[PDB]
Subunit: 449 residues, 3 copies
Amino acid sequence: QNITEEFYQSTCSAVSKGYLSALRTGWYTSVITIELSNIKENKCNGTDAKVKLIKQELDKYKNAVTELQLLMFLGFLLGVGSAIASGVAVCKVLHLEGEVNKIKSALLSTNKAVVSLSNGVSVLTFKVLDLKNYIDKQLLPILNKQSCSISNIETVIEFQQKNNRLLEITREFSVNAGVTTPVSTYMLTNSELLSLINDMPITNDQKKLMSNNVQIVRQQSYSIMCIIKEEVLAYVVQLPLYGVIDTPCWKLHTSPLCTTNTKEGSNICLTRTDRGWYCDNAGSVSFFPQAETCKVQSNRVFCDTMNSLTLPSEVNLCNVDIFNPKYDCKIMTSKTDVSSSVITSLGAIVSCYGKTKCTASNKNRGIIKTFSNGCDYVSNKGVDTVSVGNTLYYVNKQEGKSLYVKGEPIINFYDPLVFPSDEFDASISQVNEKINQSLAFIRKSDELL
Amino acid sequence: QNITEEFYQSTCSAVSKGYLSALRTGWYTSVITIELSNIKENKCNGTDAKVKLIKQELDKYKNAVTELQLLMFLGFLLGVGSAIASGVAVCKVLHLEGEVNKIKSALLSTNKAVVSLSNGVSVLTFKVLDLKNYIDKQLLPILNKQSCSISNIETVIEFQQKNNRLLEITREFSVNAGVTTPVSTYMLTNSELLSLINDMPITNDQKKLMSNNVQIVRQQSYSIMCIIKEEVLAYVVQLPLYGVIDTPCWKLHTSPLCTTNTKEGSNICLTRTDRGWYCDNAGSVSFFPQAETCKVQSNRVFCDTMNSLTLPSEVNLCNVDIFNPKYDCKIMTSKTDVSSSVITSLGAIVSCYGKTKCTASNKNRGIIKTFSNGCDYVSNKGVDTVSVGNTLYYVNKQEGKSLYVKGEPIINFYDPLVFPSDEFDASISQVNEKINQSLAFIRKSDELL
Amino acid sequence: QNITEEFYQSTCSAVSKGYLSALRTGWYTSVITIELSNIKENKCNGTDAKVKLIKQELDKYKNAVTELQLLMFLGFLLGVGSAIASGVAVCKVLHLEGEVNKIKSALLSTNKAVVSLSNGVSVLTFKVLDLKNYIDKQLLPILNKQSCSISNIETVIEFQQKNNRLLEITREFSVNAGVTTPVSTYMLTNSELLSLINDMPITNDQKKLMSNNVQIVRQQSYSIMCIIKEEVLAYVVQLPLYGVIDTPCWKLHTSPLCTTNTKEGSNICLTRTDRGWYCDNAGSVSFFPQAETCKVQSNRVFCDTMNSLTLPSEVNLCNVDIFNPKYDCKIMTSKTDVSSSVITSLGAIVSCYGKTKCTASNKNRGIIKTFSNGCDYVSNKGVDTVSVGNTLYYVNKQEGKSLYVKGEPIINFYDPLVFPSDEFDASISQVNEKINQSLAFIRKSDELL
């Protein structure tokens, strides 16, 4: 009873204005460390089941270490960037002399500390697993040399349990060339993660946002394998910083709009190409063309500013009056008269053309409405299912009021044959000029004759 | 010796007509449940190694619990839908008063029952893991023995074994914001999944299909996290319902067709844009443009009807006669004279142009054919490898006869310069008129002079 | 101080010329085998806790077995191929009578041997896990002791450990329809893979390359489940063969270039469309349009030749002089005046237009340059961050000198109104004719009047 939606029959589109923004504007880089134990060399002869298992597990431990040692419409306008450029930058610094030692020094006493590195950047550091103390002090002295007898079997379980976390981490990086996303629990546990969130210099609200949506933060995060110099494993976890919160958001749904004259082809189509998510953020509007990049948790819409264009606030005028002189609304044209449907947040837009059967159904009563060739909309409340031809769409069941804005479909104002129909990222004014050009050429070419 | 294929030299394309359809037309939604035990940490001072291990695992049990609680060419014409709209709808319903209790009541005695929810929808319910009973009857009485003794270790192994499944499920949902696809074995074992299939209201053959192909069914399925209200964990598994089965299918492979005049550029190219999978289903044909979206198991072709267009049966005329007055076949044009190859089901199409070295090879004898600049086809039988420039393509080793359909390459019928070469989703007639318009303009503009 | 980069002001583009090539030109196919044990459930009335666990684990063993039996700009110019065609071809061969026996016999005594199959192809074969011997010699004699005793628990741990590897492979294949990529450690451990590489018929240098980049080898690899005939499981690991090595490589960054006339729209834009990776390999150049397909390890660039075009070495002339008569440089045009940025290897190309705030910042001193509407570039050394509007991009911190090449941006040479602005894949020569044709229409149509 928050989120609402409006359908514009005039432009075959719909806008949902009940959403709140969640923009990633930046990156925070933290350094996670694991103090590791070097081994040389377990030398136990005689194969005892209890001896073989510890050795085998220790062999598993060593191989992990070895593997790590071994590792060392629209949208086309967005441009390119390097997602892990920030994280890689941190990794690079870590490859310096006794920088390891600097950080290895601060984390000896506590498991958490900020160390200023020679780049000058202060970074939160975490020692989450100390296999070293356990392996070097409990395990290693018994194994050397010749006689090794291991009793109390619960010990081999404890070591496999402790070692296990390291093994999944070595496993993941192995299948991701040292960059994983999303960041798994093995890489960084929730307690560790929540602890990480509290020292990040963001708003108490921003911390609040991330903590209720940790599962989202993980998908927008990167874990980057760096170095294993000295006796410490170190990798950098790259977390999103949300500089934009609680600003109004809206999602634009579009569908092909065509004339419904009786002939077979000879039809003209039209489709709005500025579909996607729009959000208010700095007096302008951040527009996200590919709405795959935006995750939704009801009230909150999570987006990454890298795949976006920053547009003027006049962009909203295209939804109410597409012919405004203040903004040239982006569109496409076609002769492709094909039926399809678009499921919106609180309903469904149905582009029905030709002899195609377009229908809406309820789970209980069955078919409840047969569409009359054109762009229409139906609420989510009285409808559960939509079938367009042989393809069946399911409708969203959220709560919220929808508004049908009546208006003559815009495509009907144009005379065929003078209409430009092969336009992919054109616009209103860009269409009008070609018609004008064609209006001039048709009109001037008979005046002379 | 089932599947066959025909190649049309006239249009540089090939259709494989030995396939059978498997269309997902709809969705079936089931609710999977796990009964959980509400437990309050025992203030136990016992420092026993085996209890600590149980304690650690019980923390793991709890951490798992805590995380879940915390969670609470062409193709562009296909339109968008909501894949999990069906699954999401069920989830929403489950958030009501004692709806949980309703299902919790029916599943106390049996692990399987159909329950009618207040929406009215009847849903198959499954209790596949009863950790509550194990924890309350096997674990809890042992952990609280006043003396934190523990007898033998098989208790901790047994608990880690039972608890393990829940942990992988909590893990997957954790890295998927509560929606996973495909549905893993941890989410639903083969035995559970197969049992599920038999109660789905489909044909005995449809059950057979899904049962011989669970791995495909899994990939076309969704698992959706709902609620963990009461002392029960509940998630909804969304399985595909295949309403179209055993209808003839065929796959269309297309490749660039250009003139092979000796000049350097000045060439004209042509390409069929309706590549992809076609299947007979309701007197019409569902067309799947991106054939990435279609999985193949020899005889069976698995597609999702939501990502499809429903076309008239005259589409087959595009394979036999492209100039028919009955259907306007979709094509595109270009001046880009670039060499490439298309590997079909029983072969490879080779588009050879310019000075480019084009060759086909057998593993044993080496080069067996050198192509003369143009569109050709080669059977899978006498050929093992095909080489176009610096890129090497491997050819499919299936069995089936191929037929070479001779015909003058169509591109030779057009006079350059009058040819429209910048067309992305145009068509035969759309070309003819533009040629006509351009034919008129050249012709009227000289009669006048 | 190896890798360098040059920015051309004349064409709003940048070339990184410090790279070395790694082209996958081919495929190598190997056969991995697991000897399995045929077992018939012991009708054992023994209710021992340890036997039950083994029984439970043996069913997982059995269920895995059962699951397997049940299993039984640019880029659009690239064309399509079949990635797994080579591996599938091998799989097909393994489906023959006693082909299995031929290989099961050679691998009975040793774990590694070359076997000639009836197709004639010689293939490296590997037995990495002999559960058969473990189950038949360690497990089976223990489970059937008339009395379902079990002595000690280490028997159940050892079996779960051995079985785990089998369980993950069946798991992976289960969620991948029998084709997995990348090939996990469970499918093939590092020791197995390294052992595998030395017998591949490549250069001692080629072996050196793969061994230092196994994690990359895995990602460009496929593992293909074949048959479980007889009592042996066999699947084929398909590894890349890199026929092109140590040849010079370069990456091309491009960005929109537009006029900066004061007016609102009425602007003309221009963009080089040949972005991606270019490499010297056979006197020609292999071009990779989608640079998603390329993994970077500093000096070495890993690409797949299937997603590439082979172009003449004269393509480089477009970088120095885009108007040379020897090669028609590929470009695109638009009237879309939108600001965006492109992060290069040693910097960032900045397309700044309209009233948009375009800025570059250092972490310490903050903003250090505000762009004056246009295409610019900045080195990585004195700059750490770039901000365009509301979107903030991070820049790479690699080391290397970049060079600013002064020259008038080419777009200023075209007179508006005669300029063609709706072109997606056109070129230099193709534009001039349209300009010419349009210059002609303006020039001839007034001489007459």
